């Protein structure tokens, strides 16, 4: 008979770590999550209450509720031909903030700084990001760097 | 061959040339098509599409609703334009001295308008006295307050008026609707 339990096929996924077993460091309990914060889900195998499902393992959501030792996270899950909004009551041990959102907020603050600078003098700030442009022309010297000619090597057993 | 992204030969999905065979409605549609084409008035365009509209999409608007629209600030002297039927409300005891333009008027509604002192006018008189819809206020009736829409979207945990014929005890008030009988919806 087939087996599809709550923690089915979660052996290595919920495997704790290598040389990171045991108690958890208290930074995780010290972190503060407010409503609207984007957070990453990585289940902790040593904590068994508030554990997320293996589907939500590795997903990212928005905090919508805060409780004593937990946080309500909203995840859009693809069910068939649409995403449904699932609400999870996860614990702070399993939950973790989003460096991507932190970086975006830092970029927003910087962007505002450059716009203020432009309003100060207007030096064509170009707020937006640009992709990797093709490299322009350059002149490379040969003094001290005379080209060393290479040739394909003959085959040898090397055993 | 072409790798099509959208569906080929797709109709507009909107209504034009209304299904009604009313020659007078056709005359009004012709007049307002001309007005919308040669005037550039968004009022003319919206009145044209409201003329195109169907019946359940043209709910009756009550004289009480018109009175509320006039009680809106700075709207006492605006010509109240409805594309549909204006019904008489017996729950109001006062009416102002507005002008109401509409496709149809019930006897009680028209009597209320003319007794309050205003004028009931048709869409052609509205066009002749306000080609650009100057100082007009368009009224719309509640489309989503009918039996069909209250039945629409029925399913578990929606609460959408199950399609039933006999209402009362022992008519779909049992297992699947209370915890004492199996589950609750």
């Amino acid at each position: 008979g087939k087996s599809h339990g709550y923690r089915s096929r979660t052996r290595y996924m919920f495997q704790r770590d290598f040389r990171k077993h045991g108690a958890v460091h208290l930074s995780t309990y010290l972190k503060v999550y407010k409503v609207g914060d984007i957070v990453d889900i990585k289940a902790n195998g040593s904590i068994q209450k508030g554990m997320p499902h293996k589907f939500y393992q590795g997903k990212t959501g928005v905090v919508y509720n805060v409780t004593k030792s937990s946080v309500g996270v909203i995840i859009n899950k693809m069910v068939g031909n649409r995403y449904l909004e699932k609400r999870l009551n996860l614990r702070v041990e399993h939950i973790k903030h989003s460096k991507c959102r932190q970086e975006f907020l830092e970029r927003v603050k910087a962007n505002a700084a450059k716009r203020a600078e432009a309003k100060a003098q207007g030096v064509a700030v170009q707020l937006k990001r640009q992709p990797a442009q093709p490299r322009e022309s350059r002149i490379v010297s040969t003094e001290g760097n005379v080209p060393q000619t290479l040739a394909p090597v003959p085959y040898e057993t090397f055993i | 061959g072409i790798d099509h992204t959208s569906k080929q030969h797709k109709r507009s999905g909107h209504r034009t040339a209304p299904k009604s065979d009313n020659v007078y409605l056709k005359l009004l549609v012709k007049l307002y098509t001309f007005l919308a084409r040669r005037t550039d008035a968004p009022f003319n365009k919206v009145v044209l599409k409201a003329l195109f509209l169907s019946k359940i999409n043209r709910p009756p608007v009550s004289v009480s609703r018109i009175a509320r629209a006039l009680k809106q600030e700075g709207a006492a002297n605006k010509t109240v334009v409805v594309v549909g039927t204006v019904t008489d409300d017996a729950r109001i005891f006062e009416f102002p001295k507005t002008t109401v333009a509409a496709l149809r008027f019930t006897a009680g509604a028209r009597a209320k308008i003319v007794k309050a002192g205003g004028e009931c006018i048709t869409l052609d008189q509205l066009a002749v006295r306000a080609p650009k819809g100057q100082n007009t206020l368009i009224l719309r009736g509640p489309r989503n307050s009918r039996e069909a829409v209250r039945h629409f979207g029925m399913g578990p945990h929606k609460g959408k008026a199950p399609r039933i014929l006999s209402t009362g005890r022992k008519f779909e008030r049992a297992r699947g609707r209370r915890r004492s009988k199996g589950f609750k919806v």
């Binding site: 040969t142 005379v146 080209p147 000619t149 | -």
Partner: protein, 51 residues
């Protein structure tokens, strides 16, 4: 009613561009250049011809 392609029908070409007229007048499609003798490097030729 009918598309007339430039690069033929000099009338349409001139309608879209009068610099076509001045380009033809000055023969800029075959334009000479002033000669200057900037000789390359002996190390350059030796690297090119290196075995």
């Amino acid at each position: 009613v009918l598309k007339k392609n430039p690069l033929k029908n000099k009338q349409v070409l001139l309608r879209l561009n009068p610099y076509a007229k001045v380009f033809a007048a000055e023969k800029l499609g075959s334009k000479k250049a002033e000669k200057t003798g900037t000789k390359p490097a002996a190390v350059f030729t030796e690297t090119l011809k290196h075995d």
